[PDB]
């Protein structure tokens, strides 16, 4: 019965034993949905669901599979309709390609833009003052989406979605790879919008 989640354990200098970006996106999605699962650590996230004989690779497909197969399970809908109006600046467009269930197209485009925005600042996580300024500026632009509904730390206020998990997966990975002070900067800048989002996602961050 339990879903098998294939994941890769992290090695130093990564500070935390679990979770590259995309495994974090899927792990946040599995925990939010409350579907039972266990990790097999192997040397891409992939799940096998024995309940449907399904084998799904890629975090967007896994989350879409969970929402479609267990729509009422756990904390609710991972993909409610939503304007995810975020676009990277021109100096980051090359990191968009290759891009991305047509009701999910906006979530897919958001996944591409967040990934590109943050990937532009790997290398802090592999650092320099100018890169940290660029990271701060990119978070400022992303922050406007999290200010649209100030009833809560998520994009839709008190309601978390897969889009919050797209960003949260990056945040979790940054906490594990940045020097502590730079993580503390990222978590504090622009009104601590991303420290709040990170902390709000803690409840969906169990490693199992």
Whole-angstrom distance, CA of residue 23 vs CA of residue 44 = 7
Q: 46 forms bridges with which residues in the sheet?
A: 6, 57
Query: CA 102, 44, 82, 160 torsion: positive or negative?
Result: positive
CATH C-level class of 3-204:
alpha beta
Whole-angstrom distance, CA of residue 193 vs CA of residue 43 = 35
Quoted resolution (Å): 2.4
Tokens 């399970």 found at:
73
**Three-state secondary structure of the chain:** CCEEEEECECCCCCCCCECCHHHHHHHHHHHHHCCCEEEEECCCCEEEECCCCEEEECHHHHHHHHHHHCCCCCCCCCCCCCCCCCCCCHHHHHHHCCCCCHHHHHHHHHHHHHHHHHHCCCCCCCCCHHHHHHHHHHHHHHHHHHHCCCCCCECEECECCHHHHHHHHHHHHHHHHCCHHHHHHHHHHHHHHHHHHHHHHHHHCCCC
Is residue 47 reached through a cis peptide bond, with omega within 30 degrees of 0 on the bond before it? no
Whole-angstrom distance, CA of residue 132 vs CA of residue 182 = 8
């Amino acid at each position: 019965t339990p879903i098998i989640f294939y994941d890769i354990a992290q090695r130093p200098p990564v500070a935390e034993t679990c979770c590259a970006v995309n495994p974090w996106k899927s792990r946040l999605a599995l925990n939010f949905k409350a579907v039972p699962y266990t990790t097999t650590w192997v040397k891409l996230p992939i799940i096998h669901d024995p309940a449907t004989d399904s084998l799904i690779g890629d975090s967007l497909d896994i989350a879409a599979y969970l929402q479609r197969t267990y729509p009422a399970s756990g904390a609710g809908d991972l993909f409610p309709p939503q304007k995810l109006d975020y676009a990277v600046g021109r100096d980051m467009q090359q990191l968009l390609f290759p891009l991305s269930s047509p009701e999910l197209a906006d979530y897919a485009r958001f996944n591409s833009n967040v990934d590109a925005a943050f990937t532009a600042h790997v290398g802090l996580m592999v650092a320099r003052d100018k890169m940290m300024q660029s990271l701060r500026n990119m978070l400022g632009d992303l922050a406007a989406l999290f200010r649209k509904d100030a009833s809560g730390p998520f994009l839709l206020g008190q309601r978390a979605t897969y889009a919050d998990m797209i960003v949260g997966g990056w945040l979790r990975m940054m906490r594990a790879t940045l020097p502590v002070s730079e993580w503390q900067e990222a978590r504090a800048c622009h009104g601590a919008i991303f420290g709040q989002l990170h902390d709000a996602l803690d409840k969906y961050a169990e490693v199992k």
